[PDB]
Amino acid sequence: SNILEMTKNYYDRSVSPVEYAYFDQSQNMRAINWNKIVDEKDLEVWNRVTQNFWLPENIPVSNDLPSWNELDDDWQQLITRTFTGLTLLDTVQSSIGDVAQIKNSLTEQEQVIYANFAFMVGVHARSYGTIFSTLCTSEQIEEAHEWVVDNEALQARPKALIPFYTADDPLKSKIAAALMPGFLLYGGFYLPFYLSARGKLPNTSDIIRLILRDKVIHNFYSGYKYQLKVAKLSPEKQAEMKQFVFDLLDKMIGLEKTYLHQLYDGFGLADEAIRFSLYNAGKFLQNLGYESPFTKEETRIAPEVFAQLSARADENHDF
Amino acid sequence: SNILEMTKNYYDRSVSPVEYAYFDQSQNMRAINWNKIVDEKDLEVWNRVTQNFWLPENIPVSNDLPSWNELDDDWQQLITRTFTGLTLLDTVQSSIGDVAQIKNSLTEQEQVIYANFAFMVGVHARSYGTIFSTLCTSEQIEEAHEWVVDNEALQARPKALIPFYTADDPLKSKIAAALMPGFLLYGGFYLPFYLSARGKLPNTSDIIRLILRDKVIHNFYSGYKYQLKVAKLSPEKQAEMKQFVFDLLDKMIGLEKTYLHQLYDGFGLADEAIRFSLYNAGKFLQNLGYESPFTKEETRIAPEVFAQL
Ligand SMILES: [Ca+2]
Ligand SMILES: [Ca+2]
């Protein structure tokens, strides 16, 4: 009789609206409570991603015109194709992937953070448009859209992830949501960093660094939430989900290698791009609480390219 | 023989990812094209809502403490309850309502704009948290959350709209989405408008005005897209959809009147709040391309409150 409550906590006898909408219409709904935070990590991530708000209009991409004009039509086509491919992946994640995470949230604040992620990946997709508007002809832009629609190897990658977003397994959906910012775009990000290391398109690489400042947090956060949810499963179910993660990454690496060999055909950059990709595949696995199986030889990045990748985003570009 | 295409444009033989994901897996996916924009209104709305980015940290709510301390416990409770009620609506809009619109978009840019809306109405909900952190006791905050969960009249309003978001009729979902910032907002916003006019809580009022600046664009945009899409129905199905809008608004006015009576009756503000609500219900219908059926008498607003619209 010593521990009887005079009133029962509202939180434990109500559900978030998204729970009510998709899972259980038997309880009443609670408003989000930002005054009593369940997980302090949510507040840290919310504060970082909102403080990091930026728009591509902030970057003087016009200052890349001299170095753009030092690249032949084949290079300009490769860049337009690569970036239109990255635009497709960001369109997938903004319109499907990140918003699909909201209903599977462990906390109230996580629901709002994934809304931020979906919006900011939309800004990432929009930023390629800003670059194209400054550097590319109408013909180059149209050709790259045609090439992306008609590239089966390119299309195979988002087609492999989308079913996990639309299905009812929240852990498989979460793994897909981590794999996109954690892995799938790095083969393309290699190209601007390779070029900027050789003195070309420095302002473009500034936009890539603003995109990556967001992507690394998206990857970290989805991996963090995956680890909390998978830890509640039986040992057998945890082993099954680990096998699924490695099986899906295995498939996605195969599809990425096939695509990058086609994309970089005639440039000989596929092997360098793939090593850069696998370095990031290792960090993706580490963010899900697993060990990287990749050899030093397989993940070797030129220091000049690593310097572009690791350079901190220019705060002058912050909103 | 004169009109054959040598190659069909990529746009008309591909689909956006969200179309591929939910509706048709038979075509390949196109990347969003921000260089060739189908509707210039999308670019205008995108530029306005992104340029209007704000966070509640950048308002000095602490400067309201003297004004807040001029309000008795009953007034402080009413404000905390009203704002926690608006927090619930914003939580519904952020987590379900706005994101449900993405897959039903007419244009590529509309998909990204509704992602912005979902995020920014999340910022609206967060901004009430900022106000409470500065002004309210932990007891006042917890009481208001308890009140929201146990208020059946309050709960009835989002419970009536959520089924449209999760169902497969995109125009009914669009209407249910617009009713949140376009109608249910105003019963609650009456209170800060009333208090501001009497000289209370000027810094809190700055947050309310930043929220309003976003919500008026949200309502315009959903209304704009509704009118474009309902224009592509048969005359018979256009008539059916008009009847649906009036039927659902009639239901939502019934639920709102019951809630505002329970929220305000002890303060004698319910009749003023309901007239304010009905005025904005008239504007909601005009925003969908319909006529207001409401009388001058039942939509009467005090000039100093009317001025803040
Ligand atoms: Ca090579
Ligand atoms: Ca009265």
PDB file of N, CA and C in Angstrom, chain B residues 161-220:
ATOM      1  N   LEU B 161     -10.780  13.248 -38.307  1.00  0.00           N
ATOM      2  CA  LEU B 161      -9.990  13.599 -39.519  1.00  0.00           C
ATOM      3  C   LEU B 161      -8.987  12.496 -39.875  1.00  0.00           C
ATOM      4  N   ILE B 162      -8.409  11.820 -38.883  1.00  0.00           N
ATOM      5  CA  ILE B 162      -7.288  10.855 -39.091  1.00  0.00           C
ATOM      6  C   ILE B 162      -7.701   9.741 -40.055  1.00  0.00           C
ATOM      7  N   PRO B 163      -8.923   9.159 -39.986  1.00  0.00           N
ATOM      8  CA  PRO B 163      -9.296   8.092 -40.920  1.00  0.00           C
ATOM      9  C   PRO B 163      -9.163   8.473 -42.404  1.00  0.00           C
ATOM     10  N   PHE B 164      -9.360   9.748 -42.748  1.00  0.00           N
ATOM     11  CA  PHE B 164      -9.235  10.249 -44.141  1.00  0.00           C
ATOM     12  C   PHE B 164      -7.766  10.205 -44.574  1.00  0.00           C
ATOM     13  N   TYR B 165      -6.830  10.444 -43.651  1.00  0.00           N
ATOM     14  CA  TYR B 165      -5.375  10.442 -43.956  1.00  0.00           C
ATOM     15  C   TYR B 165      -4.916   9.020 -44.297  1.00  0.00           C
ATOM     16  N   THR B 166      -5.488   8.008 -43.637  1.00  0.00           N
ATOM     17  CA  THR B 166      -5.035   6.593 -43.721  1.00  0.00           C
ATOM     18  C   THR B 166      -5.841   5.837 -44.784  1.00  0.00           C
ATOM     19  N   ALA B 167      -6.915   6.438 -45.309  1.00  0.00           N
ATOM     20  CA  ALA B 167      -7.787   5.852 -46.355  1.00  0.00           C
ATOM     21  C   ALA B 167      -7.237   6.204 -47.745  1.00  0.00           C
ATOM     22  N   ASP B 168      -7.898   5.731 -48.807  1.00  0.00           N
ATOM     23  CA  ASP B 168      -7.351   5.702 -50.192  1.00  0.00           C
ATOM     24  C   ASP B 168      -8.017   6.754 -51.091  1.00  0.00           C
ATOM     25  N   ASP B 169      -8.822   7.673 -50.542  1.00  0.00           N
ATOM     26  CA  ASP B 169      -9.435   8.785 -51.317  1.00  0.00           C
ATOM     27  C   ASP B 169      -8.573  10.034 -51.146  1.00  0.00           C
ATOM     28  N   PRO B 170      -7.739  10.399 -52.146  1.00  0.00           N
ATOM     29  CA  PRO B 170      -6.783  11.497 -51.982  1.00  0.00           C
ATOM     30  C   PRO B 170      -7.421  12.879 -51.775  1.00  0.00           C
ATOM     31  N   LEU B 171      -8.590  13.132 -52.367  1.00  0.00           N
ATOM     32  CA  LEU B 171      -9.259  14.456 -52.265  1.00  0.00           C
ATOM     33  C   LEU B 171      -9.871  14.606 -50.868  1.00  0.00           C
ATOM     34  N   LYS B 172     -10.415  13.526 -50.300  1.00  0.00           N
ATOM     35  CA  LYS B 172     -10.967  13.544 -48.919  1.00  0.00           C
ATOM     36  C   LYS B 172      -9.813  13.737 -47.929  1.00  0.00           C
ATOM     37  N   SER B 173      -8.665  13.100 -48.177  1.00  0.00           N
ATOM     38  CA  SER B 173      -7.434  13.279 -47.366  1.00  0.00           C
ATOM     39  C   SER B 173      -6.984  14.745 -47.431  1.00  0.00           C
ATOM     40  N   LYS B 174      -7.005  15.345 -48.623  1.00  0.00           N
ATOM     41  CA  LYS B 174      -6.565  16.748 -48.856  1.00  0.00           C
ATOM     42  C   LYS B 174      -7.442  17.697 -48.033  1.00  0.00           C
ATOM     43  N   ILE B 175      -8.763  17.495 -48.078  1.00  0.00           N
ATOM     44  CA  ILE B 175      -9.763  18.324 -47.342  1.00  0.00           C
ATOM     45  C   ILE B 175      -9.500  18.178 -45.838  1.00  0.00           C
ATOM     46  N   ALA B 176      -9.330  16.941 -45.361  1.00  0.00           N
ATOM     47  CA  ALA B 176      -9.085  16.625 -43.932  1.00  0.00           C
ATOM     48  C   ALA B 176      -7.778  17.283 -43.474  1.00  0.00           C
ATOM     49  N   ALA B 177      -6.790  17.371 -44.370  1.00  0.00           N
ATOM     50  CA  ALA B 177      -5.477  18.017 -44.127  1.00  0.00           C
ATOM     51  C   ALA B 177      -5.670  19.528 -43.966  1.00  0.00           C
ATOM     52  N   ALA B 178      -6.425  20.155 -44.874  1.00  0.00           N
ATOM     53  CA  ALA B 178      -6.667  21.617 -44.919  1.00  0.00           C
ATOM     54  C   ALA B 178      -7.467  22.068 -43.690  1.00  0.00           C
ATOM     55  N   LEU B 179      -8.353  21.215 -43.164  1.00  0.00           N
ATOM     56  CA  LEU B 179      -9.242  21.563 -42.021  1.00  0.00           C
ATOM     57  C   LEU B 179      -8.421  21.822 -40.751  1.00  0.00           C
ATOM     58  N   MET B 180      -7.208  21.273 -40.656  1.00  0.00           N
ATOM     59  CA  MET B 180      -6.348  21.436 -39.453  1.00  0.00           C
ATOM     60  C   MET B 180      -5.856  22.880 -39.354  1.00  0.00           C
ATOM     61  N   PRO B 181      -4.994  23.378 -40.270  1.00  0.00           N
ATOM     62  CA  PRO B 181      -4.551  24.772 -40.210  1.00  0.00           C
ATOM     63  C   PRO B 181      -5.616  25.782 -40.673  1.00  0.00           C
ATOM     64  N   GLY B 182      -6.621  25.329 -41.434  1.00  0.00           N
ATOM     65  CA  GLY B 182      -7.630  26.194 -42.073  1.00  0.00           C
ATOM     66  C   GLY B 182      -8.865  26.418 -41.220  1.00  0.00           C
ATOM     67  N   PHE B 183      -9.156  25.535 -40.260  1.00  0.00           N
ATOM     68  CA  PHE B 183     -10.393  25.634 -39.444  1.00  0.00           C
ATOM     69  C   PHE B 183     -10.106  25.408 -37.954  1.00  0.00           C
ATOM     70  N   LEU B 184      -9.546  24.258 -37.571  1.00  0.00           N
ATOM     71  CA  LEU B 184      -9.402  23.889 -36.135  1.00  0.00           C
ATOM     72  C   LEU B 184      -8.428  24.837 -35.421  1.00  0.00           C
ATOM     73  N   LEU B 185      -7.497  25.456 -36.153  1.00  0.00           N
ATOM     74  CA  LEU B 185      -6.512  26.417 -35.587  1.00  0.00           C
ATOM     75  C   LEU B 185      -7.231  27.546 -34.835  1.00  0.00           C
ATOM     76  N   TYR B 186      -8.313  28.088 -35.397  1.00  0.00           N
ATOM     77  CA  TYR B 186      -8.804  29.449 -35.053  1.00  0.00           C
ATOM     78  C   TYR B 186      -9.524  29.460 -33.700  1.00  0.00           C
ATOM     79  N   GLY B 187     -10.224  28.388 -33.325  1.00  0.00           N
ATOM     80  CA  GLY B 187     -10.837  28.259 -31.988  1.00  0.00           C
ATOM     81  C   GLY B 187      -9.810  28.476 -30.889  1.00  0.00           C
ATOM     82  N   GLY B 188      -8.588  27.972 -31.095  1.00  0.00           N
ATOM     83  CA  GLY B 188      -7.460  28.094 -30.152  1.00  0.00           C
ATOM     84  C   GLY B 188      -6.765  29.439 -30.267  1.00  0.00           C
ATOM     85  N   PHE B 189      -6.509  29.913 -31.487  1.00  0.00           N
ATOM     86  CA  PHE B 189      -5.777  31.182 -31.738  1.00  0.00           C
ATOM     87  C   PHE B 189      -6.626  32.378 -31.300  1.00  0.00           C
ATOM     88  N   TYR B 190      -7.940  32.208 -31.137  1.00  0.00           N
ATOM     89  CA  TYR B 190      -8.793  33.275 -30.564  1.00  0.00           C
ATOM     90  C   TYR B 190      -8.164  33.754 -29.247  1.00  0.00           C
ATOM     91  N   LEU B 191      -7.685  32.828 -28.413  1.00  0.00           N
ATOM     92  CA  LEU B 191      -7.223  33.167 -27.043  1.00  0.00           C
ATOM     93  C   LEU B 191      -6.010  34.098 -27.094  1.00  0.00           C
ATOM     94  N   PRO B 192      -4.876  33.760 -27.755  1.00  0.00           N
ATOM     95  CA  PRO B 192      -3.751  34.694 -27.802  1.00  0.00           C
ATOM     96  C   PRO B 192      -4.103  36.021 -28.493  1.00  0.00           C
ATOM     97  N   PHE B 193      -4.976  35.998 -29.505  1.00  0.00           N
ATOM     98  CA  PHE B 193      -5.468  37.218 -30.196  1.00  0.00           C
ATOM     99  C   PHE B 193      -6.203  38.097 -29.178  1.00  0.00           C
ATOM    100  N   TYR B 194      -7.081  37.486 -28.382  1.00  0.00           N
ATOM    101  CA  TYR B 194      -7.848  38.165 -27.307  1.00  0.00           C
ATOM    102  C   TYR B 194      -6.877  38.782 -26.292  1.00  0.00           C
ATOM    103  N   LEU B 195      -5.904  37.998 -25.831  1.00  0.00           N
ATOM    104  CA  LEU B 195      -4.947  38.430 -24.777  1.00  0.00           C
ATOM    105  C   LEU B 195      -4.057  39.563 -25.310  1.00  0.00           C
ATOM    106  N   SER B 196      -3.537  39.415 -26.532  1.00  0.00           N
ATOM    107  CA  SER B 196      -2.671  40.411 -27.217  1.00  0.00           C
ATOM    108  C   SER B 196      -3.400  41.757 -27.293  1.00  0.00           C
ATOM    109  N   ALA B 197      -4.685  41.737 -27.655  1.00  0.00           N
ATOM    110  CA  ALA B 197      -5.527  42.947 -27.811  1.00  0.00           C
ATOM    111  C   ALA B 197      -5.682  43.662 -26.463  1.00  0.00           C
ATOM    112  N   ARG B 198      -5.613  42.929 -25.345  1.00  0.00           N
ATOM    113  CA  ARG B 198      -5.730  43.495 -23.974  1.00  0.00           C
ATOM    114  C   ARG B 198      -4.341  43.832 -23.411  1.00  0.00           C
ATOM    115  N   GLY B 199      -3.278  43.635 -24.200  1.00  0.00           N
ATOM    116  CA  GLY B 199      -1.905  44.073 -23.875  1.00  0.00           C
ATOM    117  C   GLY B 199      -1.050  42.995 -23.223  1.00  0.00           C
ATOM    118  N   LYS B 200      -1.455  41.721 -23.289  1.00  0.00           N
ATOM    119  CA  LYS B 200      -0.783  40.601 -22.571  1.00  0.00           C
ATOM    120  C   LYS B 200       0.150  39.823 -23.513  1.00  0.00           C
ATOM    121  N   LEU B 201       1.268  39.322 -22.976  1.00  0.00           N
ATOM    122  CA  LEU B 201       2.154  38.292 -23.591  1.00  0.00           C
ATOM    123  C   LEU B 201       2.587  38.693 -25.002  1.00  0.00           C
ATOM    124  N   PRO B 202       3.267  39.849 -25.176  1.00  0.00           N
ATOM    125  CA  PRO B 202       3.717  40.289 -26.500  1.00  0.00           C
ATOM    126  C   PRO B 202       4.748  39.376 -27.187  1.00  0.00           C
ATOM    127  N   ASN B 203       5.620  38.716 -26.424  1.00  0.00           N
ATOM    128  CA  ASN B 203       6.696  37.862 -26.997  1.00  0.00           C
ATOM    129  C   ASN B 203       6.101  36.517 -27.421  1.00  0.00           C
ATOM    130  N   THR B 204       5.208  35.944 -26.611  1.00  0.00           N
ATOM    131  CA  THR B 204       4.421  34.738 -26.977  1.00  0.00           C
ATOM    132  C   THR B 204       3.648  35.041 -28.264  1.00  0.00           C
ATOM    133  N   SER B 205       3.061  36.237 -28.362  1.00  0.00           N
ATOM    134  CA  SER B 205       2.288  36.698 -29.546  1.00  0.00           C
ATOM    135  C   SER B 205       3.164  36.680 -30.806  1.00  0.00           C
ATOM    136  N   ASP B 206       4.462  36.977 -30.685  1.00  0.00           N
ATOM    137  CA  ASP B 206       5.415  36.931 -31.829  1.00  0.00           C
ATOM    138  C   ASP B 206       5.528  35.490 -32.346  1.00  0.00           C
ATOM    139  N   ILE B 207       5.550  34.494 -31.455  1.00  0.00           N
ATOM    140  CA  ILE B 207       5.589  33.054 -31.848  1.00  0.00           C
ATOM    141  C   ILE B 207       4.264  32.708 -32.538  1.00  0.00           C
ATOM    142  N   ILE B 208       3.132  33.105 -31.954  1.00  0.00           N
ATOM    143  CA  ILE B 208       1.785  32.860 -32.551  1.00  0.00           C
ATOM    144  C   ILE B 208       1.760  33.437 -33.975  1.00  0.00           C
ATOM    145  N   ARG B 209       2.313  34.635 -34.183  1.00  0.00           N
ATOM    146  CA  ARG B 209       2.306  35.297 -35.516  1.00  0.00           C
ATOM    147  C   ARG B 209       3.224  34.537 -36.488  1.00  0.00           C
ATOM    148  N   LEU B 210       4.348  33.991 -36.018  1.00  0.00           N
ATOM    149  CA  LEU B 210       5.253  33.171 -36.874  1.00  0.00           C
ATOM    150  C   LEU B 210       4.538  31.874 -37.277  1.00  0.00           C
ATOM    151  N   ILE B 211       3.812  31.253 -36.347  1.00  0.00           N
ATOM    152  CA  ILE B 211       3.015  30.026 -36.640  1.00  0.00           C
ATOM    153  C   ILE B 211       1.955  30.378 -37.688  1.00  0.00           C
ATOM    154  N   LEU B 212       1.224  31.472 -37.473  1.00  0.00           N
ATOM    155  CA  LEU B 212       0.137  31.925 -38.378  1.00  0.00           C
ATOM    156  C   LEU B 212       0.713  32.155 -39.779  1.00  0.00           C
ATOM    157  N   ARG B 213       1.888  32.782 -39.879  1.00  0.00           N
ATOM    158  CA  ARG B 213       2.537  33.104 -41.182  1.00  0.00           C
ATOM    159  C   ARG B 213       2.723  31.810 -41.989  1.00  0.00           C
ATOM    160  N   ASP B 214       3.051  30.705 -41.319  1.00  0.00           N
ATOM    161  CA  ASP B 214       3.216  29.380 -41.971  1.00  0.00           C
ATOM    162  C   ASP B 214       1.843  28.787 -42.301  1.00  0.00           C
ATOM    163  N   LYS B 215       0.927  28.760 -41.332  1.00  0.00           N
ATOM    164  CA  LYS B 215      -0.363  28.029 -41.459  1.00  0.00           C
ATOM    165  C   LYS B 215      -1.230  28.642 -42.569  1.00  0.00           C
ATOM    166  N   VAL B 216      -1.176  29.961 -42.769  1.00  0.00           N
ATOM    167  CA  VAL B 216      -1.975  30.655 -43.826  1.00  0.00           C
ATOM    168  C   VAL B 216      -1.476  30.213 -45.209  1.00  0.00           C
ATOM    169  N   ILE B 217      -0.177  29.932 -45.353  1.00  0.00           N
ATOM    170  CA  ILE B 217       0.390  29.388 -46.624  1.00  0.00           C
ATOM    171  C   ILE B 217      -0.016  27.914 -46.764  1.00  0.00           C
ATOM    172  N   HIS B 218       0.044  27.131 -45.682  1.00  0.00           N
ATOM    173  CA  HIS B 218      -0.386  25.705 -45.670  1.00  0.00           C
ATOM    174  C   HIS B 218      -1.829  25.607 -46.174  1.00  0.00           C
ATOM    175  N   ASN B 219      -2.714  26.462 -45.658  1.00  0.00           N
ATOM    176  CA  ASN B 219      -4.161  26.426 -45.997  1.00  0.00           C
ATOM    177  C   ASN B 219      -4.357  26.873 -47.453  1.00  0.00           C
ATOM    178  N   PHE B 220      -3.711  27.968 -47.880  1.00  0.00           N
ATOM    179  CA  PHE B 220      -3.766  28.459 -49.281  1.00  0.00           C
ATOM    180  C   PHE B 220      -3.368  27.325 -50.229  1.00  0.00           C
TER     181      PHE B 220
END
